[PDB]
C-alpha cells in the first residue's frame, strides 16, 4: 500500500499544474478525456469532501480508494448514488435526477419527456412516499445489474 501513495503522489503532482497542493477544476479539464466526459464535474464535487471547490491529496486518495479491488458493492453503489445526489443530503430529489440525467442525455430528450420518465422512475422506487430517493431505495432498483464490477481502477 505504501507504494500506492507514492504512485498516487507522483500522479497528483503532475495533475497539479501550478503546484499549490490541491487540484482545481481547471486542471482536471486540462486532460483531453476529462473534458468530453459529462460527469467530470460530478466526480470532482464528490471527491471534494470539504467543499472548497478543489481536491487536495488526502481527498484524492480517499476518492481513488472507492474504486479498488479491495472495495465491495456497498461503497461502489454509494459512489454511484452520490453522482445523482447533488446537494449530498442522502436523498435523490426529483430535480437532481432530472439535472444529472440532462447532463448525460443532453438535448436528445425534450424536457417534458425527461421529466415524465423521471416521475415514473421516482414513483416506482419511492417506497415511503416522500417524493424522493434514499440510498436504500436506490439499491432496490439498481442492484442486480452488478455495475460495481466495472467500477475498478
Amino acid at each position: 500500500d505504501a507504494d500506492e501513495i507514492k504512485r498516487l503522489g507522483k500522479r497528483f503532482k503532475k495533475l497539479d499544474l501550478d503546484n499549490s497542493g490541491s487540484l482545481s477544476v481547471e486542471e482536471f479539464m486540462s486532460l483531453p478525456e476529462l473534458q468530453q466526459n459529462p460527469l467530470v464535474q460530478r466526480v470532482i464535487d464528490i471527491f471534494d469532501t470539504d467543499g472548497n471547490g478543489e481536491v487536495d491529496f488526502k481527498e484524492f486518495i480517499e476518492g481513488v480508494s472507492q474504486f479498488s479491488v479491495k472495495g465491495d458493492k456497498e461503497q461502489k453503489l454509494r459512489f454511484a448514488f452520490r453522482i445523482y445526489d447533488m446537494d449530498k443530503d442522502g436523498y435523490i430529489s426529483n430535480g437532481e435526477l432530472f439535472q444529472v440525467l440532462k447532463m448525460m442525455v443532453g438535448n436528445n430528450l425534450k424536457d417534458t419527456q425527461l421529466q415524465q420518465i423521471v416521475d415514473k422512475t421516482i414513483i416506482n422506487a419511492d417506497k415511503d412516499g416522500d417524493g424522493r430517493i434514499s440510498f436504500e431505495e436506490f439499491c432496490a432498483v439498481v442492484g442486480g445489474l452488478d455495475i460495481h464490477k466495472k467500477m475498478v481502477v
Binding site: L31, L34, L39, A80, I117, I147, H148
Partner: protein
C-alpha cells in the same frame, strides 16, 4: 420541490381499490377507471386480477363464432395506444349506447397495453352483450414474450397479471358473423375452413398453434397483388409472417359465394388511411375484402390515420381520426437508474483511468 418542468402532470401514486372500481351491483366504474388510467395511475394488483378474471369468465362462455347483429362499430388494431383508444370511443360512440366489435391485437408495441386491456375488459364486464372482443395474433404467450406486453406487466404490475391475461386471451372468440353478411376475423381465411361451421368445430382455448385453421384465422393476409393476381394458387405460404398464408382474390370470392356472405372484415395490416377496400367481388359488386386499422400514427412514426367501421343494414360509414398526445416511456419500460447507471459506472471509471495514467 426540485421538480424542474412543473407544468408536466404527475401520475397519482394511489392505486384504485376494489370498492373504488366495483360497486354494490358488481359493475365497474368505467368513468373513474378511464380518468385514472389517463394519468398513468395503477389499480391494486388484486383489482386488476379481478377485472381480468371476470372478463375471462364472460369470454369463456362465448362461442368461437359470435353472432353480432347491426348496428355495430368494428375496430381494428390498437396495440397499446390507450390514448388513441380514448379518441376511438369518442369517434365511434359511447359503449353505453353503441355496440362494438374489436378484431384483436390489443397489446404490444404501444406502451399502454395493460391499460387498454383493463379498460376493454372492464367494458366487457359492464356491457357483456354489446361489446365484443376477438383474438388477434398478438394475444398469445409467444408474441407478448418477444415484444413488450410481458415486460409491461412485470414492470407496472406483476407476472401474475401477465399470466391472468394469457389465460383470458385463450378465451377470446376467434370470429364473428356480423349481421349475417360479414365474416369478421383478425387475419383472414384458411385453406382448412370452407364454411362457417368449420370455425365452430375448433378448440380455441389454448396458445395458437404454428399451423392450422386457428393459426390462419389469426395470421393470414391477402396477397400483395390481391385482386390483380397472376398467381393461380388460392393459398400460398406467408413468408412475411413466417407462418400461415396469403389468400388470393379468387379464394375469398369462392369462400364468400359458397357461404352466401357479402364480405370479409379484418385488420392485421396497417393502412395509411386507416382502412382499405379491395377488389369488388364479381358476384355482389361489393368489396370482397376490407381491412380496418385503428392505431393512428402507429408506432409514433407512420403518421397514418386510424379508422373504425360503423355499420347498420346496407350502410357502412368509415370514420377516420388522427393520433392524440401520450406520455413518454423509455424502451423496455426502463427506469432512469437502470438506463444510465451503466453509463455512469463507465464514465467515472473512464475518468479515473486517465487520471491515473
Amino acid at each position: 420541490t426540485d421538480r424542474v418542468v412543473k407544468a408536466v402532470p404527475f401520475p397519482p401514486s394511489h392505486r384504485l381499490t376494489a370498492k373504488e372500481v366495483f360497486d354494490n351491483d358488481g359493475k365497474p366504474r368505467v368513468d373513474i377507471l378511464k380518468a385514472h388510467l389517463m394519468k398513468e395511475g395503477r389499480l391494486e394488483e388484486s383489482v386488476a386480477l379481478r377485472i381480468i378474471t371476470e372478463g375471462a369468465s364472460i369470454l369463456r362462455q362465448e362461442k368461437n363464432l359470435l353472432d353480432i347483429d347491426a348496428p355495430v362499430t368494428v375496430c381494428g388494431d390498437i396495440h397499446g395506444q390507450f390514448f388513441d383508444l380514448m379518441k376511438l370511443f369518442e369517434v365511434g360512440g359511447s359503449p353505453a349506447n353503441t355496440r362494438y366489435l374489436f378484431l384483436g391485437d390489443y397489446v404490444d408495441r404501444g406502451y399502454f397495453s395493460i391499460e387498454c386491456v383493463l379498460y376493454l375488459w372492464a367494458l366487457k364486464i359492464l356491457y357483456p352483450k354489446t361489446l365484443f372482443l376477438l383474438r388477434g395474433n398478438h394475444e398469445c404467450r409467444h408474441l407478448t414474450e418477444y415484444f413488450t406486453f410481458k415486460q409491461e406487466c412485470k414492470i407496472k404490475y406483476s407476472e401474475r397479471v401477465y399470466d391472468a391475461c394469457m389465460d383470458a386471451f385463450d378465451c377470446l372468440p376467434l370470429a364473428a358473423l356480423m349481421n349475417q353478411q360479414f365474416l369478421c376475423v383478425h387475419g383472414g381465411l384458411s385453406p382448412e375452413i370452407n364454411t362457417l361451421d368449420d370455425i365452430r368445430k375448433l378448440d380455441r382455448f389454448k396458445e395458437p398453434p404454428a399451423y392450422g385453421p386457428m393459426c390462419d384465422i389469426l395470421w393470414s393476409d391477402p396477397l400483395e397483388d390481391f385482386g390483380n393476381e397472376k398467381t393461380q394458387e388460392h393459398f400460398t405460404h406467408n413468408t412475411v409472417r413466417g407462418c400461415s398464408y396469403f389468400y388470393s382474390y379468387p379464394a375469398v370470392c369462392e369462400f364468400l359465394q359458397h357461404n352466401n356472405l357479402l364480405s370479409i372484415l379484418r385488420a392485421h395490416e396497417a393502412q395509411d388511411a386507416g382502412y382499405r377496400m379491395y377488389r369488388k367481388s364479381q358476384t355482389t359488386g361489393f368489396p370482397s375484402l376490407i381491412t380496418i386499422f385503428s392505431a393512428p400514427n402507429y408506432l409514433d412514426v407512420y403518421n397514418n390515420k386510424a379508422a373504425v367501421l360503423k355499420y347498420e343494414n346496407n350502410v357502412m360509414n368509415i370514420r377516420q381520426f388522427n393520433c392524440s398526445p401520450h406520455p413518454y416511456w423509455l424502451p423496455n419500460f426502463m427506469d432512469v437508474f437502470t438506463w444510465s447507471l451503466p453509463f455512469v459506472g463507465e464514465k467515472v471509471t473512464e475518468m479515473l483511468v486517465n487520471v491515473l495514467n
